[PDB]
Design a binder for these strands. Structure first.
Lengths: 272, 94, 94, 263, 266, 267
DNA sequence: GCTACTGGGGCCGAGGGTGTTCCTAAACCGAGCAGATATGCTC
DNA sequence: CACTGGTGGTCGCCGCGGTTTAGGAACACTCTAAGATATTAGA
DNA sequence: GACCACCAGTG
DNA sequence: GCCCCAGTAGC
């Protein structure tokens, strides 16, 4: 009997696995602990499986995950994306040709960028502005949004540091990195499953996941970052688990998985 | 999107792994999930094509009088019976 | 009024009859029905009061991310585990 | 453990049992037939259990059905109600005393009768009419309504005594659920306002208010089709009508709305 | 005008309630012979028997041994509406309520109630004399009395004498409720006790509560047996069987209600 | 673009290098910059450290069958380098560059250049005629009964032995070809002769070498008629791909086929 | 009936002209009566 | 771990101040070269 | 006469 | 080295 992926909307957002060997037993995705504890993972019902340090996946496991269309994301400290195994040739020709068509033309590229701006900030972008100029405007808006959310939730805020070598009682930046990493995960899974290219970006460019960063940044501050600030004020013992749990709840309530693809189609609808 | 329960008996490991792909096996041969109509009927196709010797019962949540409905594959001592529309289970003797 | 499934194991017959009072037993120790939250809390009261040696697992439909939740009483090789909020089941060795 | 009843709106409408002994096994309500087939019955999750001829109920089964608030109803020919057993002290003193208080005062009794008339028929009751006069008006309109549906569904009608079989079966089901609800709320089934004397007068009032809405015409349909198994089709249609109309969930507000006319 | 059946099948033979026990002894019961059939444990009733009892109006009541408990009853809520409206008429009118309460007092104690007392005042005198009666039973039977202490949650974590008293009162509420049902009245419509679904049972039972029922609880309390609740239940069963308290409670009920000076039904 | 195949062992990291420990203990130490692409054959288990190292130096991981017979999974899913995907995409969207690339495919497949005044669908026709004649020729030459190409996709067992062999051969060829397209960094869905489907480019490049070795081997296995013909054809394509170095040679063929657009390569 | 264990065998379930269109606890309050650096019992 | 057979023991799991308030498949299409010079087997 | 606890024996 | 299957005990 054939084995096909189920629609992404009907799935759990994310699962994090650590310190165990991932096997396939009787056609099942199984996480075996060093003590012998077997833990079945409903791979077909999850959109992303994050693999933390300590995991040793098998060839059959990677094949099975790719067969039921479940993205594998190898993950580093604070949930940051390190690698990703996915469905080879899982992109639709019409979708990818439309995206690349928009990226090749400079005018259509600026159209898509302006659409991303209007959808991110609600208000249209200033007219007669280039991509670098909208990039600087977007940068200042992001900076002031970080500072403003910081003053709202009452969190000590200085920089928005990405490099983990700067966090030596800095939990807010860790929470932002973990939350945005979850969002990047589900957004990459949505882009691959929808048939688009994560590397073909419009605002971000040259990065291997530029389109993921664009689409995810459009809806990042709507729900995902403010939750990271809420977790940040309430100083936790395990920030990773709190941020993951909160991001999961946010994804269920805001229906992010179901709204990702139509958001992509709305973004690329700039050029007719 | 409704709740789903699959109880298997004497099925080969292929069907048990296939069910472990989507559903949560909370006891030996007892799988629980929450799927759509399409995914439910697909899972049932897996059950039909993969059991071949054992008995399976699938119960999913509905909006009927009992709040749920169920169907069976194979033969079991416990057999559904129809009482004026209400489906119950009878325990047949040897 | 959500869907309910109670899977019992090594449970004395009092709890099996009591569960049969409200829920349809479609396989040995596997009961299914459609009850409200109050009735579910009462059935769990019965489970906790009458098992005393065996293990019981109860699952019911909800509006969480997995669409259902479950709870356990007693010890079983299949033990629930927490994965950053999402509860699954793991099989302990001998 | 206490083993307290379940609210009535949460359970199934009705179950019919036939030709087997009813036992209690490990606390469960079991039906055994002549061949040995044991069949558990969710006694706590059904409003009332109908016992047909051939059943042999045990003591522990009557006690068990009583403890879970599930009315037992012995029925005989064509499902007509013969007898019933329920909780011995399952009457709420405030509801019972309010009902009886309405029944003793002639004025409040007239108010309740006029409320039942205005609820059964869309138009209000004729003013300055006594209780017996309204009873006769409702009776004549009941005869003309039976004959009216008889002409609509095209079945020969000589009076209310196949058609009497279907009507008796469906209306008998409605009397079953209505009696179960009346006993569950705590009111008395014998204390009636339109109907008096018989031990189920209040059931006849409350159920007769709404039987011609959907219950009787469906029995006229089954009576015109006239299949080889009329009782089963009547029971099926009764369960679908009770589920669709959610009769069980809106029976109590009908009783309280009727008795609310006493101010 | 009633009979207890146990340990047999209740069937119909030639229009009579036949009871077939384990030894084959058939008990043929003509329809006009009994108005109520008290069904004890071990009985299985047939559909024809219930049909006969229905077509002649016989009241079936599923009870425990000697009416210690009342598990169910036919015609639930009440078959005769005239008796129910009678009791309710007696209970809603404050004057008839005080008459019935005064009759309860004059039947419970030998002396009539103090004149021109309200229902709550007679309730206070009743409670005080109940306190003194608890003390008197304690001293007579020589048991240490600390009060009417009982935790509704933990039955085992309670005083032994309060366990015995509680079991005795439960059996008494059994036979009493059975008597009220056989007479045809509502157990909830009460005069001294009101509000709860067995108030009338509490009143009628309270009339005779401290006559060999509670004193038997203190008697079993002296011995301190291994299972005092069972010993009290069985002792109450034997007392109900010998003293015929169930049969004798119906005239008491009819008189207590008859003190309302309102025409009773027939 | 270098690559290495690994099977039957654990892939871990030792001293910043990809070590592979096989069933018997043979440790294969692999310098981090020694290989651009690792083909993971059945029987391999990857540790998190290995994925981290390959990630931080940009090494492409591909989970394949034996010798690239199937492509199960691949790292950098969808494509890591946007420049190559936009290069292939620009070649495909412009009809002139499309016809140049198609003409290069034709000339590389047969040896003779296609006729000058020809469109894309016309070259599709010439291709169809020549592969029909090739089917007839191979059938007559190996002496297997030929009644056409068609089959029933709803049931594999309801088909000829020759159609089963041909289908299995083209399947493995699509495996190695797809692996090549992924190792070169291009999109398997962006095709020139084939269009619309998610593996159009795989069919395009696969058609160049399809009737050189794998289909002749399919007619050889069909003539020998073994018990399990699909397994024999698949293992035969496995041996051919290993001995002929089909995967390694396919990549420069891709770079040339795309280079025929006369447009600056990404590099 | 499910679970574990151990040899033996295989690395495996495919095929590709393209694009459109349609199918319910607690708080508050009555009494008496013993007996009182008052509340406590009892209804 | 579930089902069943026989024997000995029970007849049960209670307690009562009263009232108010807190997306596939179907079809519709290109094109070619051989050759039934129409129609067809291939992409 | 109805029901339950117990204590194994088997698949 | 990873995984399925068949058969055979064991509870």
């Amino acid at each position: 009997l054939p084995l096909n992926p189920i629609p992404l909307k009907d799935r759990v957002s994310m699962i994090f696995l650590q310190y165990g060997q991932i096997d396939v037993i009787d056609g099942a995705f199984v996480l075996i602990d060093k003590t012998g504890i077997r833990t079945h993972i409903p791979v077909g019902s999850v959109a992303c499986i994050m693999l933390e340090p300590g995991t040793r996946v098998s060839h059959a496991a990677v094949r099975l995950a790719a067969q039921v269309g479940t993205l594998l994301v190898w993950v580093g400290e604070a949930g940051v994306r390190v690698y990703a195994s996915g469905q080879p040739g899982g992109a639709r020709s019409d979708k990818l040709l439309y995206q690349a068509k928009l990226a090749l033309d400079e005018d259509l590229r600026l159209k898509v960028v302006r659409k991303m701006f209007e959808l991110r900030f609600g208000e249209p972008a200033p007219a007669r502005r280039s991509v670098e100029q909208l990039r600087g405007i977007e940068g200042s808006r992001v900076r002031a949004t970080y500072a403003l959310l910081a003053k709202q939730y009452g969190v000590t805020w200085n920089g928005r540091r990405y490099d983990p070598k700067d966090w030596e009682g800095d939990t807010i930046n860790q929470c932002i990195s973990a939350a945005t990493s979850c969002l990047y995960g589900v957004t990459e899974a949505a882009i691959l499953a929808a048939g688009y290219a994560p590397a073909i970006g419009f605002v971000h460019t040259g990065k291997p996941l530029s389109f993921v960063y664009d689409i995810a940044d459009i809806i990042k501050f709507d729900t995902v970052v403010p939750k990271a600030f809420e977790i940040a004020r309430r100083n936790p013992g395990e920030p990773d688990r709190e941020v993951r749990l909160a991001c999961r709840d946010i994804f269920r309530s805001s229906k992010t998985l179901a709204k990702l693809i139509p958001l992509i189609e709305d973004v690329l609808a700039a050029g007719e | 999107m409704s709740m789903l329960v699959v109880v298997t008996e004497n099925v080969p490991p292929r069907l048990r792994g296939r069910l472990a792909i989507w559903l949560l096996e909370v006891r030996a041969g007892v799988y629980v999930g929450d799927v759509s109509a399409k995914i439910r009927e697909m899972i049932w196709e897996q059950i039909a094509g993969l059991a071949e010797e054992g008995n399976v019962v699938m119960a999913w949540a509905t909006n009927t009088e009992t709040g749920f409905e169920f169907q069976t594959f194979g033969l079991n001592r416990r057999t559904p019976v129809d009482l004026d529309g209400l489906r119950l289970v009878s325990f047949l003797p040897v």
